Amino acid sequence: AIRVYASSTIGNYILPEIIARYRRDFPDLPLEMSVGNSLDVVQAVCDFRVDIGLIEGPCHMAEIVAQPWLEDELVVFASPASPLLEGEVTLERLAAMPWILREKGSGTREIVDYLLLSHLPQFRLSMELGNSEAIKHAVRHGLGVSCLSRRVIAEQLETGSLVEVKVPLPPLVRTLYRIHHRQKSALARFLRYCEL
């Protein structure tokens, strides 16, 4: 049996298909998947409840072995009818927007705090939501702007109900990590399917 805990982006937009490919080639092999945020994954790995954990924020703990797994780009997005789309986008223009952010303790919020909102002086924090679907649908209804992994809003980017905003910053690329406890099981068979 394998126990995997993934953060929101991974557990909802990367992991389901991997399990499909895994349980296709290995039926009768158990897999219990749990999805929370990056903090919940880290604490669940520390408690010896899961075998491996997949996080989208950093993790600098002595008892945790973190290895880079995939790359992921966060994007500022807005509704197509947003005034931010017309004209040159600057830092001061982005700080003046109503930002809908993920709760503190999520990897998305921590990374965007480091790469983006760190340079938006006194950015207006309009709403804090505990999941990215509520953030996605709020932004597409013109309730503000946000920053999420491209995997979360991919379908809405192609459909058109959400438009990527050109940010005057280097691309907001982040690393998704695989973690496990140092002091801690057919994982090699499962880790095969997490390769590109």
**Which residues contribute to the site for its own copies (CB under 8 A)?**
8, 11-13, 15-17, 19-20, 23-24, 31-36, 127-131, 133-134, 137-138, 140-143, 155
Cα–Cα distance measured from residue 27 to residue 21, given in angstroms and rounded to the nearest whole number: 10
> Which residue lies nearer to ligand SO3 by CB, 93 or 180?
180
Q: Can you tell me which of 4, 8, 144, 165 binds ligand SO3, judged by CB under 6 A?
A: 8
Please report whether residue 53 would count as binding ligand SO3 according to CB under 6 A: no
Q: Which does 82 bind (CB under 5 to 8 A by kind): ligand SO3, its own copies, none?
A: none
Token duo for residue 155 = 């379908």
Site map for ligand SO3, 57-76, x if CB under 6 A?
x-------------------
Q: Can you tell me which of 4, 5, 14, 38 binds ligand SO3, judged by CB under 6 A?
A: 38
Token duo for residue 94 = 């982005």
Cα–Cα distance measured from residue 190 to residue 188, given in angstroms and rounded to the nearest whole number: 5
Q: Which does 72 bind (CB under 5 to 8 A by kind): ligand SO3, its own copies, none?
A: none
- Give least dist CB 83 to ligand SO3, A: 27
Cα–Cα distance measured from residue 134 to residue 138, given in angstroms and rounded to the nearest whole number: 6
Cβ atoms of 162 and 139 closer than 8 Å: yes
Site map for ligand SO3, 110-149, x if CB under 6 A?
----------------------------------------
Cα–Cα distance measured from residue 134 to residue 127, given in angstroms and rounded to the nearest whole number: 11
Instruction: Report CA 98 to chain centroid distance, whole Å.
Output: 21
Instruction: Report CA 28 to chain centroid distance, whole Å.
Output: 30
Instruction: Pick the closest to residue 77 from 172, 170, 164 (CA basis).
Output: 164
The contact set with ligand SO3 (CB under 6 A) reads 7-9, 37-38, 56-57, 102, 106-108
